[PDB]
Design an enzyme around this catalytic site. Structure first.
Site, PDB file in Angstrom:
ATOM      1  N   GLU A   1       0.814  -1.212   0.000  1.00 37.76           N
ATOM      2  CA  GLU A   1       0.000   0.000   0.000  1.00 37.76           C
ATOM      3  C   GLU A   1       0.850   1.265   0.000  1.00 37.76           C
ATOM      4  OE1 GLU A   1      -3.044   0.045   2.945  1.00 37.76           O
ATOM      5  OE2 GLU A   1      -3.889  -1.894   2.354  1.00 37.76           O
TER       6      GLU A   1
ATOM      7  N   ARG B   1     -13.384  -7.495 -32.999  1.00 38.14           N
ATOM      8  CA  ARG B   1     -12.306  -6.529 -33.161  1.00 38.14           C
ATOM      9  C   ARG B   1     -11.372  -7.014 -34.263  1.00 38.14           C
ATOM     10  NH1 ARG B   1      -8.234  -4.350 -28.352  1.00 38.14           N
ATOM     11  NH2 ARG B   1      -6.658  -3.395 -29.722  1.00 38.14           N
TER      12      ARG B   1
END
Ligand SMILES: Nc1nc(=O)c2ncn([C@@H]3O[C@@H]4COP(=O)(O)O[C@H]5[C@@H](O)[C@H](n6cnc7c(N)ncnc76)O[C@@H]5COP(=O)(O)O[C@@H]3[C@@H]4O)c2[nH]1
EC number: 3.2.2.6
Lengths: 331, 331
Positions: B84, B230
Site C-alpha cells: 500500500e 475486433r
C-alpha cells in the site's frame, strides 16, 4: 570464471562512458577486464568514427550481457549523463541490479548520482585503479524482469484510443438509443470496466446470461500506424433488471490491463499477484490524472473499478444496473 | 498559507501510514497539520471500518493534493511497505518530488528506504515531533509529469498485438504471395518500422509516391476486452526499385511509439525531444529483450530503426528495398 554468452550477447560487458573526460579512464578498465578473458565493447576501438549514433550504442548494449557504467564528477555535467548514460539504465530495478555495474571515480557521493542511479549498489574505484578486480566479479555471474507499466499503459490508452473514440461519442450513443428507442433505459456515457484481477473477458456476455450482445456503434475507420482502414468499434450490450426490464449501455473493458493478468499467469514473468495489484493501482491513478487534464474526454466515459473474486452470476449484472442508475438519474 | 484546492483535490494531504505500528504517530501529524487550517485524510476517522480496501485508499490519494508518507523502522518490515505504501509512489520523479512528503521516524537511514524512495528528499522528524512544521511547508505549494513509458509500451505491444498476429503469420504471408504471384519479389517477414522521431505515418504510401497500397492480409477477427469482432488487419504495400520492378512486403509502423511523438508536440506534456529519444531507446531494448524470450514470434518479424530527419523522397523507398534484399537473400 569466464561465463558463457547467451545468444544475443556477443560481448561480456559494454563500457558506457563519457568520451569527453573519461575516455582514458574507460580504456584503462577495458584492459583490466579483457586481460582476464572477458570480451568487452569499447567505443573508441569497436565503433566506426561516424557510426557512434544512439542506435549503434543501443545495439551494443543489446548484444552484451553486462554494462559497465563509468561515472566521474566531470561526466555528471556533460549531456551524456542526461542522455546516453540513461539508455543503459532500465526501469526494472531487478535488471538494473544484475546488469548495471556502476563504477564511481573521484567523487563517489551517491547523493550526486541522478535519481535513476541513486538506489543502485555501486563500486568505488580508487584514483589508482586498484578496485578493478571488483568490476570483474559482477561480470562473471551467468525470470524476466518487469519495470513499471502504469505510465506506458495510461498514456498509450489515452492518445491511442480514448482520444480517438471519445470526441463526439455522446452524439453517437444518443443517436443509437433514439434509433433503437432506448430512452429511459440507456445512458449516453461509455462504461470502461476495471476488474481488480485485471482479467478482461472476451465479451461482457461472458459474465452472466443476463448480458446480451445487442449490436455496436458506427465503426470508426482510420489509417493509423501504416494500417489502412483500422476499425475502432464500440459494442452495445444489455442487462436485464430484476424487474425483467432490459437496460442498455455501451460497455467494454480497459483491455490494456489484461497484459498484467497474462504476465501474472506466465510463470516465467517477474510479476506476482501482489505487484500486479500495485501496478494496476498506479495505472488507475495515472490514467485518472491524465483524464483530469482533458475534461472533454473524461466526462464522456465512466471508469468502474470492482472486485471479480466472487463467482456470483448476479453480482456483475446488478453492478452494471446500479451504474446506469447514476447516469440516467443525472439526465 | 492555505493553498486553494484543485477540482479533484478535496483533501490538502493524505496521510499514508502503516496502521500496525505508526497509527498513533500518523494521528499526531494529523493534528499538527490540521491545526493550521489544512484538511487531511486520516484513515482511522475518515474511512469506514470495512471500507479500507485498496481502491478506497487510491481514491483518497486521487482526491488529495499532497500525500504525507509516514515511514518508521517497524513499517518497513510489514507488508504495507511492499504494497500500500508503493501505491502512493509515482514512477515520475517529477510528480514524486512535488506530491510525496516522506516523513522519517526513528531510524532515518535513507539506505534502508526501498529503491523507489531512496532518491527522494525526505524530512527527518525527531522522536519528539518538533520538525512537524517542516511537513506543513511541503503542503502549501499550490506541466504534466511523465513517468517511464518503455515497459508499458513493450509488454502491451507484445501480449496485446504481436502475440496475436505473429503466430502462423508465415503461412498467411506466403499464401498471399503465391496467390498474387509475388515470388522472388516479396519476403515472408512482417516489417515493423521504427522511425527515430517516433512520428508514425497514417500510411507508408505517405513516405513516397513509390510506395503503393496493394491490399491486406486476411482479417483476424477476435472478441477481446469486451469488443466483439475486433479486427486485426495487416496491410500489404509495394515499393518500386530503381530498375522499375515492384517489390512487395507486409509492412507497418510500431504505432505504440507515436504517443511519444504526440506528447513531445503537446506543449503541456512534460516530455521534451531529448527524453523522447531516451524513452524510445529504453523501449527498443525492452521490446527486443522480450522478443528474445519468444523465438517463435521474434524471427517472424523484423524491426527496422532508422532516421527520418531528412526530406529525401528516395531515402525511405530504397531503405525498404535494401531491407527486403536480406530477407529474399536468406530464402
Ligand atoms: N477496448 C479497445 N478497443 C480498441 O479497438 C483498441 N485499440 C487500441 N486499444 C488500446 O488503446 C491503446 C492504443 O495504443 P496503440 O494503438 O498506440 O498501441 C497498440 C498498437 O500499436 C498495437 N495494436 C493493437 N491492435 C492493433 C491493430 N488492430 N493493428 C495494428 N496494431 C495494433 O498494439 C498496441 C497495444 O494494443 P492494445 O493492447 O490492444 O491496447 C490498445 C492500446 O493500449 C483498444 N482498446
Amino acid at each position: 570464471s569466464v561465463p558463457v554468452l547467451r545468444h544475443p550477447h556477443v560481448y561480456h560487458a559494454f563500457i558506457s562512458y563519457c568520451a569527453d573526460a573519461d575516455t582514458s579512464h574507460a580504456r584503462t578498465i577495458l584492459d583490466s577486464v579483457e586481460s582476464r578473458g572477458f570480451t568487452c565493447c569499447f567505443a573508441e576501438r569497436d565503433f566506426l568514427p561516424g557510426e557512434c549514433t544512439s542506435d549503434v550504442v543501443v545495439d551494443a548494449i543489446h548484444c552484451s550481457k553486462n554494462v559497465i557504467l563509468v561515472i566521474s564528477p566531470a561526466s555528471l555535467q556533460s549531456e551524456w549523463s542526461k542522455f546516453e548514460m540513461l539508455m543503459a539504465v532500465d526501469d526494472s530495478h531487478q535488471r538494473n541490479n544484475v546488469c548495471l555495474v556502476p563504477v564511481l571515480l573521484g567523487g563517489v557521493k551517491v547523493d550526486d548520482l541522478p535519481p535513476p542511479l541513486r538506489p543502485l549498489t555501486c563500486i568505488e574505484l580508487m584514483d589508482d585503479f586498484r578496485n578493478t578486480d571488483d568490476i570483474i566479479q559482477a561480470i562473471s555471474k551467468p525470470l524476466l524482469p518487469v519495470g513499471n507499466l502504469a505510465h506506458g499503459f495510461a498514456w498509450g490508452y489515452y492518445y491511442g484510443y480514448l482520444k480517438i473514440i471519445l470526441p463526439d461519442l455522446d452524439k453517437t450513443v444518443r443517436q443509437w438509443r433514439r434509433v433503437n428507442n432506448a430512452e429511459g433505459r440507456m445512458s449516453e456515457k461509455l462504461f470502461l470496466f476495471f476488474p481488480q484481477s485485471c482479467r478482461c473477458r472476451d465479451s461482457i456476455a461472458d459474465e452472466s446470461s443476463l448480458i446480451k450482445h445487442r449490436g455496436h456503434l458506427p465503426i470508426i475507420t482510420k489509417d493509423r500506424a501504416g494500417i489502412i482502414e483500422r476499425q475502432y468499434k464500440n459494442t452495445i450490450y444489455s442487462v436485464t433488471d430484476d424487474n425483467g426490464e432490459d437496460y442498455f449501455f455501451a460497455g467494454e473493458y480497459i483491455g490494456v490491463i489484461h497484459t498484467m493478468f497474462e504476465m501474472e499467469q506466465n510463470a516465467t514473468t517477474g510479476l506476482q499477484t501482489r505487484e500486479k495489484y500495485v501496478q494496476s493501482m498506479r495505472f488507475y491513478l495515472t490514467l485518472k490524472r491524465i483524464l483530469d487534464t482533458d475534461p472533454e474526454c473524461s466526462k464522456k466515459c465512466k471508469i468502474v473499478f470492482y472486485k471479480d473474486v466472487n463467482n456470483s452470476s448476479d453480482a456483475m449484472p446488478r453492478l452494471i444496473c446500479n451504474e446506469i442508475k447514476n447516469q440516467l438519474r443525472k439526465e
